[PDB]
Symmetry: C3
Subunit: 304 residues, 3 copies
Amino acid sequence: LKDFLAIDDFDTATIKTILDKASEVKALLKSGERNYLPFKGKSMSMIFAKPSMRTRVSFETGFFLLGGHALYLGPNDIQMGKREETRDVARVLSRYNDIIMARVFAHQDILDLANYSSVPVVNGLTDHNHPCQIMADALTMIEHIGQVEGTKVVYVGDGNNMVHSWLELASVIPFHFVCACPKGYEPDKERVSKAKQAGLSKIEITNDPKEAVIGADVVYSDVWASMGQKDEAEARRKAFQGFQVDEALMKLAGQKAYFMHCLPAERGVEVTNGVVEAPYSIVFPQAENRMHAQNAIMLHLLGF
Amino acid sequence: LKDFLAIDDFDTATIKTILDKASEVKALLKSGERNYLPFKGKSMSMIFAKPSMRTRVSFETGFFLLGGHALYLGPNDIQMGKREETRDVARVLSRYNDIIMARVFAHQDILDLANYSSVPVVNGLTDHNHPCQIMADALTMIEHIGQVEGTKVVYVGDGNNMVHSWLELASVIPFHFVCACPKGYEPDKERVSKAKQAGLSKIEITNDPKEAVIGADVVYSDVWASMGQKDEAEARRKAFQGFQVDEALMKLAGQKAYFMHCLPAERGVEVTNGVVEAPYSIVFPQAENRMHAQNAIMLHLLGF
Amino acid sequence: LKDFLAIDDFDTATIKTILDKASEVKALLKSGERNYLPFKGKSMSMIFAKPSMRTRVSFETGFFLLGGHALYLGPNDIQMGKREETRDVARVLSRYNDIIMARVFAHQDILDLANYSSVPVVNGLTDHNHPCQIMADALTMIEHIGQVEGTKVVYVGDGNNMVHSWLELASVIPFHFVCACPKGYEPDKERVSKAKQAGLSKIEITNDPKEAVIGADVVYSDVWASMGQKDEAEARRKAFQGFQVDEALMKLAGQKAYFMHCLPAERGVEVTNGVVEAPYSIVFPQAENRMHAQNAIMLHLLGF
Ligand SMILES: NCCC[C@H](N)C(=O)O
Ligand SMILES: NCCC[C@H](N)C(=O)O
Ligand SMILES: NCCC[C@H](N)C(=O)O
Ligand SMILES: NCCC[C@H](N)C(=O)O
Ligand code: NA
Ligand code: NA
Ligand code: NA
Ligand code: NA
């Protein structure tokens, strides 16, 4: 496959190989050495439909550390969908660059970019999913717990793009994934069903977070109103009463539970300060691993 | 000459030399060579007053492939001529960088930048002209037709910055150039006269596109309302009825006619989808050639 | 010390050593050497709260020339203190990059960034101070006058961030510094006192520019502020009558006096055209030296 649009576009063995390579190249960089430059003479255009810190800095810095040059095309720079159609952007950038990263709104825009591009496309977040984040999260789990297989991962909050990529991972690695969400804020039904069809993981959707978290290896949260839906924050506050991850919830989860959050976090909304800053919080190692997982994904896509 | 502001600031032999060099360096990059780095240790500031995908990505990527670093200064980053006088911008950037690219509104802003800069300045599009686009277009014609000399190029649409640079090329290479435009939307009379003064090319301005295109080697179009004039889009849509490039017009043009468009294109306005996507449309090879022509221009200006 | 937040966080010997290195590396780059690349494999995130030409281009170009990659994170890219707390930004970017440069409003935001970052932080301008600008200005003085020690520097204008960093330098190098400001627009009392405490320099605050400038080595001007309340703007205009640096004021200053201005300049407001363009004006060499002083600063912070 040419592109990295969803984790479960790939098989188990391939995903595990990418995660192994992620550890290997991370260790090389951590050693302080800077003479492994496989991307020398290669370029990446990064299309962003909305501003970013983690995705932007991790991709641009990682690509540089492996020898290439990433271009930042911000929202107003190329105005994809206003000034110019996706299919034309894809066909132009494919003639200049070796790979394209895109963070878009409608998922169909990333499918269109992939379909019309002759070079690989990497998904940097859409309204539907966030595969590179979950790949990083899998690496983080491997480093802290030992493995993803057989763990219990409990997401608390909105059934959103992050939950969809957790469901992708649950389609290629066998674990127990729970989404504790308010009624009416479930993840997409087809995405849940596709994970169940894979037959690897125990998948549960529940409205009771206090029961869901018990025995977790990971309690995961995210904002209740995502980029592109910030005008909905107030009604969601009401619907999401009881879904804040606070110290009491982490105590219910138990002593082996780590806290994870893709970031940015809104303290006092989906999570408390005390949770973010607790010893069991691994949000900053988690953020770092965006660069290491993505480096391995790009290596894979470019034939290394 | 220090700068690349207009094609016919240079003589015929120099323009032909730059186009040759464009082919040579293109072949080297297409071969996979990444060890020709003449711009090692050099920097370029790119000043953009306007949106850009082709100009931005072609300049930044090409400069990187030849070993240098291009800085992207977008519309709100330095605000040349508004936050700070152009003469001051020129004199500061000339002390940091080795070359400056600028995309501006008033042509006088680019003249000011060139006049006060000790380093070469490259025009990346003004309200007046767009010489690097037409240099790429000439390379594209050489590759598809064999040569520019003795061809018939028919531009259909607004008498604009693209037409001005076509007229620049017609001042240094002998061919037949027709601009078919609605009454009131003619190119600048002084620019037409300067092309005619050179005595190389047959130059016609007409309001009848259906006659104009007959026997064309190239039918060229562009948006009817350029950047900076988008408040006129509805008025222009009405004034330009009869100037859309559709499949019927390309049939009138004949069997040897290629379709070219600088891009971005607005299907259903100046051109149909069927024309943009036809076998005779070479818009994507055309766009690629921005990088190859500009690479040669920059090499020439920097003494290579 | 990990960070470069204010010049007099460092001792005299260290500041002099940095300025000596600034000359040495400048001379190496001026020779045409591009083989000294101490920042190979290193990255820098640059956080900007507002537009910038000098700080932006000098940091990005300089870091490139010494072998690293600087990322530009503009006002709408991360929103430090607004979309995401400074402590979170610090802890994320510290895991991707080797050094962070920040231009912020509240000084407390730069302190917070330094406190939470495991990597060095460089202050690129706050509401409080601008230490990299004054380090550049010291280098410029050394080159033109021969030394900072024993000179007379007269700043004419608002008691602002630039005055604060002048007072920082006067706390580590013995000279005579005068701030000639409208009554009511004095620099912060504590910053003046801290400079006096160091016991090196003669420090004067006055409201009489025509007397202040007599015998100056440097007459210094700066951006003048625009006002949010329209009667407050008119009152400020009235207060600053007599504080324009014109040819008459430079004549009163005398034959030894150079004119300096951190830029951008607004001719007809703080300074006249005739002064900016005069033979005694060194504003363009001054601007260049932002790159050379900052290169030495970054070298020092990174252990070179
Ligand atoms: N086994 C690879 C060692 C690291 C090497 N010195 C580097 O430059 O990455
Ligand atoms: N930075 C993580 C982004 C994920 C979030 N659900 C969003 O779509 O905003
Ligand atoms: N990308 C090409 C731009 C040319 C057009 N006439 C404009 O000025 O908008
Ligand atoms: N580019 C000048 C920076 C210093 C100025 N006093 C300001 O605060 O804007
Ligand atoms: Na993200
Ligand atoms: Na263009
Ligand atoms: Na109109
Ligand atoms: Na500045």
